[model samples]
Target chain A: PIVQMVHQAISPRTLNAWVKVVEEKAFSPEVIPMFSALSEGATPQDLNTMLNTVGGHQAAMQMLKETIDEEAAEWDRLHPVHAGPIAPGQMREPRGSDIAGTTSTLQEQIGWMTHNPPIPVGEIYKRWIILGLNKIVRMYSPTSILDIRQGPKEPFRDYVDRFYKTLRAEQASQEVKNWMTETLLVQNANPDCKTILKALGPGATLEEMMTACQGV
Target chain B: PIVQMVHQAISPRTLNAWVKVVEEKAFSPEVIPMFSALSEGATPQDLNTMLNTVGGHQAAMQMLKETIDEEAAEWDRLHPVHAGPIAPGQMREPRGSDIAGTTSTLQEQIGWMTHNPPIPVGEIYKRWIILGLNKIVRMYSPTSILDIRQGPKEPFRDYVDRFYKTLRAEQASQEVKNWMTETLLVQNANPDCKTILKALGPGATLEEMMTACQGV
Candidate 1:
């Protein structure tokens, strides 16, 4: 697809413009044509007629689309969409920050914006829309963990299930995660749950405590 | 590619075999052929000849290959190759363990390894290789943080440079990360470096602390 896109992009006029651009720079030379297209190199007949021919080899080499591929990959690596908690600087934006795919596979868009210059500043703005989405920060707070208690009539099973689900969800509860031994559940647990944890005594795994609570 | 592979896998004989498999279980029916291939609904001429046509489907219906595509996707979602520290279950494997591309795009390998079963168990083990690489641990130790001190006759600039470098690299020092205020540098710094931090008084940034050390 990349090769096809590049081929379609390079008209003979575009090739000549490039040749004109190169001739003005460090060196001047005709692009070599292919083997089957013209048997041997620099045959007298071929050069006599067409001075403007683009070389199959040099044209392919100059297309070095992979160069931008590396930069795009590097860009992604530097500002990756990391898996878990959003890093500090990566706070979420208010309602309207544009993100990728609102308008675009990202690779095709990146290549299109980069290769086709006179590339609009609007295009640059549109492209930057991809980044802000990856930069999310903590949406909730430490004090919020307190709200994850047992409902008044909640069953012990429901309470325990909710307790652990919230535990998995609450990254801000660093101390909770650290000491979740998880007697942390005990802190928020109901009277019935507390009774079970107390009776389970020392060396009880969370598994045992939950099981005992359920059994009771 | 997926269509081509599926088409190749389904020879008329294979198609009849599937027809046989289906005919054995549920309702018996002839597969609908294409309008271009044979045209419209079942007519006497078509059935008079070949009773065994597989389908545009019910055959395509049976090949709900996307069912496993979802499962493969779910598998990846459950055990992602996350972009930072290995999570608790995701520790790095020992040397002999397998890894992907050791033997395969992951999508191609995943689709290939899955679709073609009577698939070797070795292929399963080989596929499992991809996981261990993602599960790395903090291979070094916390006591190791003490080694990041200033060297005698080491330039204060290099000391500061090395100090910052090690700090960025050492995630094991969560306290270092947390309170790196980072007078933590002062604790391990050389006498001259400490003298500079002391005189910089309060509110000196790590940037200024290093710059002043360099300037002094």
Candidate 2:
């Protein structure tokens, strides 16, 4: 579950780099993990706007480059750069190779980080996570996300059960999670569950929701 | 899920026979499927007591015998009771063959129904189900029922997700379902989920419960 990724610590370099972009002077430690965990906090919209502005895209690129440099420097400090038997300058073996998006592997994406200029806005947050402690790539498509429906033979309770799995497994911003949660349940639930969902007033809890599903 | 089993029509013979044992007055149709689905209504405890008294056991035995008799009679009348080219007395192929509890096959269990005199109290409700439209065998054990818990790597939301599947798949009476729902969640949830479970106010719902798990 991506929920697990939210708890991992962000490196100081990544936090500082991210903070500096929005603030230029500025943001500091403990922010990146929150950013990684919560793309909602400084979401892609936020990043999108930052990159949309004149010259902001270049700063964003520099931010990633400097962090990657500092990240490598942390690797080098212990090794004394090229002086150590295992040269610190030698690229560390790719750690998060499993994450895939847009035909690029994590290592290849890092290479993109090193070289690609005027990076695409959509790739900003995802690229950040790919380089973070947990490399959860964006994996869901609108087709699959919207396609999550209560199967014909599926009990509504079980459908909701699978929805939790879907939500956890699908990568999206917090905004996406909350919005899609409503939209999918509203549109896709079987009549039994759909009726119960409509009956639910706002401020309902998950247990309440699940119990109602169980209730139906 | 066995919820589907509840909606099936019960045969008149089975109902008549069951009512006769307790009332000897005469019950009618549409009762057996309910009995199959809702053992808690006339639970095993009810059956146990019904079978316990000497005269009661004998009466109960008579009741089942009569029901099976009527059931076979219904089978026979359609074939004109041996007047047809096919022998009406010919044993029909066994249906509900997949249902298992004891080592005996379902056909063998029905044979037990025919020949075995004092049936075990525990076997009554289950035998009734095996004989019904959906032959859901009693499949759960104390070990498995007690074994469901949040996995170490499992998120609480997902754990609750799985609990629904467990509850649906694990065959039990409504009494058992209600009882174990509390017992398992109260005792076995991980600390993250446990805290939320404890914090949940009474009258909290499943959605609320799940949301709280999601909340954590």
Candidate 3:
């Protein structure tokens, strides 16, 4: 009858934990016969005390421990993290990650949180504005200065003015700026200006270069 | 001389665009000969007008059009709405979607901005709070009533109380809750209690059921 009572109360999960205890030799061999003998004659409290002494406290506690874990796991299976405790028919607002149908895995999110917490939510809006403005400032490419060519019949003065404006917008290094100036003189200036540039060599200032080209 | 001057201002990138323009038959066969002939003597204004007539506006506007596109593309590449504008060496803060690593693509951000702008900066802080709390709420599952079993020495009253506590935590429907109660009585209750539960039909209220089991 005591054996029947024990069987009725112990769950299958706890049964497994009991099987493991025996497999691991958690209880002394002498306790195994005593465990069966107690079921027939001993009261439950007597049984519990004897089991604890022979099998170790943990082994005796194993049944309840396993039962608690089973309860916790069953709960987890019903309430997934992404679903957010929604009732059967409740309407949930689109989660941020769901905005684009992008699969941000659960592990990735947990990993990010592990290393970087306390996301500065209050400041993010201001940060975005500053980021947007800074991005706009860098939008223009400095290399585009090379794209400006002297027009077929464009005068030396007009071409020089356009180049200087483009150079300033480019924010180029001094070497690149100087090289472009010399390239413009050699390629677009009239013959006289080209000869004047050739005489001046590589070291001429923008003012001197422009004046020399203008003289042509 | 005019052909040489035109060549001086065009960059390799622009030169490629010019090549693609011709490759696409921007100038008809009839216009091609004239295009070549004009280089010999035409003014830059005449050349610009002629290019526009052949290719509508693109040939003449290529430099500026390409420049505008370059600027727009540069801005987009850096801003990358989903990733935000993170600098090469600076640590980037977690984006909202980092909560789940959701893509929240650029198009989605643009769409949200179109309808929700200007997104109030202060309100976003509250949004994170709600999201974080919701996530935490979902992290734990309620205890499953099914995990409850009669303890070795637990009385019928004590078992029912434990069962009721787990049942309430589960928040199960009436049908599931009632069924679990019967299952508990048949499987775990002492023989007298099980017989009392069987005598009472399925329609009995929890109070009547408990009283009947207690009488046993």
Note the Cα lDDT for every prediction shown.
0.37, 0.42, 0.40
lDDT of 1 by residue, B1-216 (tens): 112122111234323433443354222111111110121111112221122353443433333233323434554566564467755633322111112222222333333333434222223332232121111112222334457777766655556545544443344455756465355667777787778788878666444555566544
After TM-score superposition, the amount by which residue A44's alpha carbon in candidate 1 deviates from its true location, in angstroms, is: 50
lDDT of 2 by residue, B25-115 (tens): 1211122322332232232333333333324335445555445444444533553423335345433332222112222343443443343
lDDT of 3 by residue, B1-216 (tens): 123222111122222233345547432322234334433432222222222222222212333223333443454466455556766644333244321113332223322322323332113322332232222222222345667776655566788877765554454578977777666655666666766777776667767767776644
State every prediction's TM-score relative to the real structure. Answer: 0.25, 0.24, 0.20
Output the better candidate (2/3) by TM-score. 2
DockQ score for model 1? 0.01
Ignoring the other chain, what TM-score does chain B have in each prediction?
Answer: 0.36, 0.38, 0.31
lDDT of 3 at B140: 21
Clashes of 1: 9
In model 2 chain B, the worst 10-residue window by lDDT is B1-10
